[PDB]
Amino acid sequence: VPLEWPLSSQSGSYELRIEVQPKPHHRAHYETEGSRGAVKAPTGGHPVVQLHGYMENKPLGLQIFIGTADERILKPHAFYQVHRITGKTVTTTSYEKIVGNTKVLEIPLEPKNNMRATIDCAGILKLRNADIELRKGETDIGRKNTRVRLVFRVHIPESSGRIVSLQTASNPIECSQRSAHELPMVERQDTDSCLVYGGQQMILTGQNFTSESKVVFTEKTTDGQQIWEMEATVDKDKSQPNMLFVEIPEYRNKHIRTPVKVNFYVINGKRKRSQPQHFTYHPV
Amino acid sequence: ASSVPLEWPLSSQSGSYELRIEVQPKPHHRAHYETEGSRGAVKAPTGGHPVVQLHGYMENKPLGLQIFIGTADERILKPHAFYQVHRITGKTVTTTSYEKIVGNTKVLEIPLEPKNNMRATIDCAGILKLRNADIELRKGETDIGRKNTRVRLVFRVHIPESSGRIVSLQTASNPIECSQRSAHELPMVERQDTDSCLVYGGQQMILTGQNFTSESKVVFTEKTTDGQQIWEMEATVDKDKSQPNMLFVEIPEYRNKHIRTPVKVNFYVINGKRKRSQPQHFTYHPV
Amino acid sequence: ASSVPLEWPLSSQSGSYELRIEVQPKPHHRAHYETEGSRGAVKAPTGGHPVVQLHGYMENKPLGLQIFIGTADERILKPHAFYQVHRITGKTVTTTSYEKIVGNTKVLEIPLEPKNNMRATIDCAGILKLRNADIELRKGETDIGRKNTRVRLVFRVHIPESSGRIVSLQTASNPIECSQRSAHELPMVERQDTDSCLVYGGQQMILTGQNFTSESKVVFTEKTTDGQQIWEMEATVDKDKSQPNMLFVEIPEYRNKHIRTPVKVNFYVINGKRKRSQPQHFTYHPV
DNA sequence: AGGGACTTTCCGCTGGGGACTTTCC
DNA sequence: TGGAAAGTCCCCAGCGGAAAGTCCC
């Protein structure tokens, strides 16, 4: 009965499975924000849980709560609470209740549905560390502890007064926001010059090169006044996290007799840009 | 008996009495949280501390100066609810100090003695930042923490006259910002007007890039094929001429005066202790 | 053409004159659109129709009694722009009437004849809801249509004194809701025995109005002129004695305990989440 | 202490469900 | 007119970003 307690997902001819695991990440929401929705599956759908081996005809109650991911044996995560998702499109009916300091949702597992359930009313609230730590008793730390597991459990009543209690966890779920863009960083370039017609393909080696990354060639005066800007073409295909394939643009002045020294940088999004790289254009 | 509300308005001068702020504190002062230790006492631009003094005091008795953090907002002065003075003790802490709570305002009390001219140097006073989460929860305070990060150093003293009357002088410093600035932006060099020069150095070099702050420095290096930096000289920057995109630098002299072959060295720009640009290239020429 | 601008605030008396509303209109009168027939005339809850009168007129010249529909907001009186008086004619219509138009406002005018003691039963008036889209597409307006669906019957009779001056009384009626919508949802306070009490509260108040479900709730709030609802406290609403028409509220305790000057605050009934009465008035007294 | 690294709060955008309004019976 | 149904437009869950607050290294 108590939340934190060793339980297997299967006993005798009874087995509780996560037929459909949730996504790896799921930014949780604060009480001061709206809701950020329910935990979804990679497919775009939702997780699914099921109880195999049931003979009876009386529906059961599937219990849901946010637990820990760390090594230690499963226990309610003191910094997260399942958030009950209501209507709008929610299909599984759900009841909400507290258990100690843990909120717990409970949807029905009706046999008319092979004791299968589509968890799509489960969201993830995030308590404020300060609020919890300060609690007299808790000796845990919220700081940097932002992973969880959807814990599902069903209690199977036996016509023998006995009760078989099964429990099941989802794969770990990361619940913190993750920056949309990383800072690009060019460490090496297989080209440092080339004729003004450009054309050739240059390969950059660095970090955080997403497929959206872009490359810009510029040239400015000692003043700082930019007197030339040209975006360079990238070989999306070959492009990888650590390597970049670009097509050195044509320089602005076809006919030059002196080598021209220009600049270029990779950029992710509207801000995250690496730093000025050097290149040179040689006379025809 | 000297208990007059901190919300009570008092003035800097009364008759033959005036409490001026001799040495105002710095515009900014990073305040510390309780989870942190302390981050010093407030300091004056001098590099030392702020100074308070009571002028027009003929008597020869030891008075008690009071200190606390006030609100530097569009309303009337009053104790800031998210900030408290912080008592600093020990070593270089010259002036002595006494701490005490009033309402929810921690008040510091230093001594104002005649032997020193009813003058004092503030150096046992720091600014602790209370948590927005804690304060707002208090059944009462209707104020917000969100962006309220300006404070003021209020000083007040209760003078007891023979006439039985107790004059009360109060005075608040100028505004002090209590939120650490913005960490450093990565300097970026896109161009330089010089690529080499005689080992005697001494010439001025102009760099063109972004994120250069007068608080920027330029460092020259040189390593072996192994990467062993076998040299490291800091070049002088022309603080005046320099700007966001233009950094003026004085090429430092080379280590080995007499060489026969050209030496290829490097140099980088740096903001703060960390944020530094990537190595740039430069060459010193034999005499 | 002695029509004096409708915006000019005017007392309901000027000397021994007194323009009163003998009988008051119902709390509600669903108005009709120009795509519907007419939903009839305004009536008194007594069953009959609203009654107006003028006291202090010894003369014999039967005077006219203008009538237009006005706003029922916090602001000063002003001609409502999403409502027009509808001139109703017929058999049972005892009183005659003349319909004119002052600018974008349609005005009605019946006779206030002396041979009736300067009385007048208003059984010939209706209210026409205008489409919000059309009044909001007017070059010169700034008021919102949506939700703004409360109005008041406005009267004002011109009187010529033998001294050259033209007096002018005006006496609008209670507020009237014109939408079957809110008429059925929104709760309306119409009576409150207590206007004020001391800052601690406790004192129990009785409200008499309409649409008071067991789910009703009262809420005291206070806001700065800037509209900053700073305080909001829900008063315990006696679920017992309360009835479809009466509520017993335990006046909550005011937020500031040591207040000096009376603080005026607002309170309101509210069912569900949207269904809420109109801002009521109360004033807390210091101790 | 100087500088960041992780946690909260707060701003904006968008689509389909209501809240209201206006047309019908 | 009393009762709605059809029509319109506001509003907020859900998210994605990112600035302000806290507090480690």
From Swiss-Prot, chain A:
Member of the multicomponent NFATC transcription complex that consists of at least two components, a pre-existing cytoplasmic component NFATC2 and an inducible nuclear component NFATC1. Other members such as NFATC4, NFATC3 or members of the activating protein-1 family, MAF, GATA4 and Cbp/p300 can also bind the complex. The phosphorylated form specifically interacts with XPO1; which mediates nuclear export. NFATC proteins bind to DNA as monomers. Interacts with NFATC2IP. Interacts with FOXP3. Interacts with TBX21 ('Thr-303' phosphorylated form). Interacts with KAT2A. The 9aaTAD motif is a transactivation domain present in a large number of yeast and animal transcription factors. Rel Similarity Domain (RSD) allows DNA-binding and cooperative interactions with AP1 factors. Residues 27-34 bind DNA. A motif (Nuclear localization signal) lies at residues 270-272. The lineage of its organism: Eukaryota, Metazoa, Chordata, Craniata, Vertebrata. Expressed in thymus, spleen, heart, testis, brain, placenta, muscle and pancreas. Isoform 1 is highly expressed in the small intestine, heart, testis, prostate, thymus, placenta and thyroid. Isoform 3 is highly expressed in stomach, uterus, placenta, trachea and thyroid. Plays a role in the inducible expression of cytokine genes in T-cells, especially in the induction of the IL-2, IL-3, IL-4, TNF-alpha or GM-CSF. Promotes invasive migration through the activation of GPC6 expression and WNT5A signaling pathway. Is involved in the negative regulation of chondrogenesis. Recruited by AKAP5 to ORAI1 pore-forming subunit of CRAC channels in Ca(2+) signaling microdomains where store-operated Ca(2+) influx is coupled to calmodulin and calcineurin signaling and activation of NFAT-dependent transcriptional responses. It comes from the Eukaryota. This is Nuclear factor of activated T-cells, cytoplasmic 2. It comes from Homo sapiens. It is found in: Cytoplasm; Nucleus. The chain holds residues 395 to 678 of 925 of the full protein. Residues 1-180 form the RHD domain. In resting cells, phosphorylated by NFATC-kinase on at least 18 sites in the 99-363 region. Dephosphorylation induces a conformational change that simultaneously exposes an NLS and masks an NES, which results in nuclear localization. It is linked to Joint contractures, osteochondromas, and B-cell lymphoma: An autosomal recessive disorder characterized by musculoskeletal and hematopoietic issues. Affected individuals develop painless fixed joint contractures in early childhood, have osteochondromas, osteopenia, and can develop B-cell lymphomas. Induction: Inducibly expressed in T-lymphocytes upon activation of the T-cell receptor (TCR) complex. Induced after co-addition of phorbol 12-myristate 13-acetate (PMA) and ionomycin.
UniProtKB/Swiss-Prot annotation, chains B, C:
Induction: Inducibly expressed in T-lymphocytes upon activation of the T-cell receptor (TCR) complex. Induced after co-addition of phorbol 12-myristate 13-acetate (PMA) and ionomycin. It is found in: Cytoplasm; Nucleus. A motif (Nuclear localization signal) lies at residues 273-275. It comes from the Eukaryota. In resting cells, phosphorylated by NFATC-kinase on at least 18 sites in the 99-363 region. Dephosphorylation induces a conformational change that simultaneously exposes an NLS and masks an NES, which results in nuclear localization. Member of the multicomponent NFATC transcription complex that consists of at least two components, a pre-existing cytoplasmic component NFATC2 and an inducible nuclear component NFATC1. Other members such as NFATC4, NFATC3 or members of the activating protein-1 family, MAF, GATA4 and Cbp/p300 can also bind the complex. The phosphorylated form specifically interacts with XPO1; which mediates nuclear export. NFATC proteins bind to DNA as monomers. Interacts with NFATC2IP. Interacts with FOXP3. Interacts with TBX21 ('Thr-303' phosphorylated form). Interacts with KAT2A. The 9aaTAD motif is a transactivation domain present in a large number of yeast and animal transcription factors. It is linked to Joint contractures, osteochondromas, and B-cell lymphoma: An autosomal recessive disorder characterized by musculoskeletal and hematopoietic issues. Affected individuals develop painless fixed joint contractures in early childhood, have osteochondromas, osteopenia, and can develop B-cell lymphomas. This is Nuclear factor of activated T-cells, cytoplasmic 2. It comes from Homo sapiens. The gene is NFATC2. The chain holds residues 392 to 678 of 925 of the full protein.
